[PDB]
């Protein structure tokens, strides 16, 4: 993809009625890090599934192992869960040449606080201003009220 979504705002897509070649991507190695959980990095397009999902988001290099089936970590536990009952591959490309800007990338918004941790394969794109304090948010930012 030219561009991904943030982790919290996880971009979900479903594969059905087609064939994707997972072993080809692994061996061409256009992504720098390939880790697979419950599935093989190769000879995987020989395994039959009816609903294959391939979803896109952005993480840091130290987070690549965290976003994975059966794994935990700050990103895996708070902004995108992947339970032990699921299997799949986590494929990561360093996009620094397209996405990094001096001053930061404002097209991707990272979630720090949620009232509860985000669920398995849940997408949430909300920017509703977070209520941290006792004084309710009025649709504007203020102390203990922030995007």
């Amino acid at each position, epitope marked *: 993809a030219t561009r991904f979504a943030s982790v919290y705002a996880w971009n979900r897509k479903r594969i059905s009625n087609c064939v994707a070649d997972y072993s080809v991507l692994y061996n061409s190695a256009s992504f720098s890090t390939f880790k697979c959980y419950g599935v093989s990095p190769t000879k995987l397009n020989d395994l039959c599934f009816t609903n294959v999902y391939a979803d896109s988001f952005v993480i840091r290099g130290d987070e690549v192992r965290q976003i994975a089936p059966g794994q935990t970590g*700050k990103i895996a536990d708070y902004n995108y869960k992947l339970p032990d009952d699921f299997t799949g591959c986590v494929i990561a490309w360093n996009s620094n040449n397209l996405d990094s800007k001096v001053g930061g990338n404002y097209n991707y918004l990272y979630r720090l606080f949620r009232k509860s941790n985000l669920k398995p394969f849940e997408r949430d794109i909300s920017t509703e201003i977070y209520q941290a*304090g006792s004084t309710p948010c009025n649709g504007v*930012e203020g*102390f*203990n009220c922030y*995007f």
Partner: antibody
Amino acid sequence: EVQLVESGGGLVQPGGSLRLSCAASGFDLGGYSMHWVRQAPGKGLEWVAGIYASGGATAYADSVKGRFTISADTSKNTAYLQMNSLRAEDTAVYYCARSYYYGGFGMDYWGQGTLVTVSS
Amino acid sequence: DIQMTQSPSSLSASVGDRVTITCRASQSVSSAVAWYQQKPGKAPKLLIYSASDLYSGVPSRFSGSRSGTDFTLTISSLQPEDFATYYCQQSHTYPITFGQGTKVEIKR
């Protein structure tokens, strides 16, 4: 390398006041709140006050509410703390610090501290 | 007003050993738990800015994780320059509070 630098320390008579200042170096204050943190002799850290650099919203620690006032200025890339009605118990090293938004993040930027004493 | 408690008040570890500090807020502060290092005469140095994130410029020796409500705060391989009083901080809400300070001995 990003650092903050405190100034304006000194001595206050009980019931008096002192104004602290801190300048940021190596980064842009916008997007972060500016905070003041205190360490009295024999004590660990206690947060005192803070303001959002890009919004102007403020809040204070319960221990200083109604007594302390703060401000920040992103064109100067500096910040201030006005401490009135001080007592001997407020003797402490005051530190400047900055963090994202209005909270939830730690002090991404931190200074060296300046000593403020109060005494009879 | 959310208070923080730490335990133990001191830990004994030699150079190369591990130091573990347990800290918790009285109320949830989510992932926002920081860590500072203080030597006599100096400002505490920020090590961790949030429980979830290590501060830039800080050695990889310093790390931690969450389980339930608690924050396990640790030094994986203690160095001579790490013998300092450490503080745990929550920064979710105001006032921002800190624990009591945990000291480290070098097993002499």
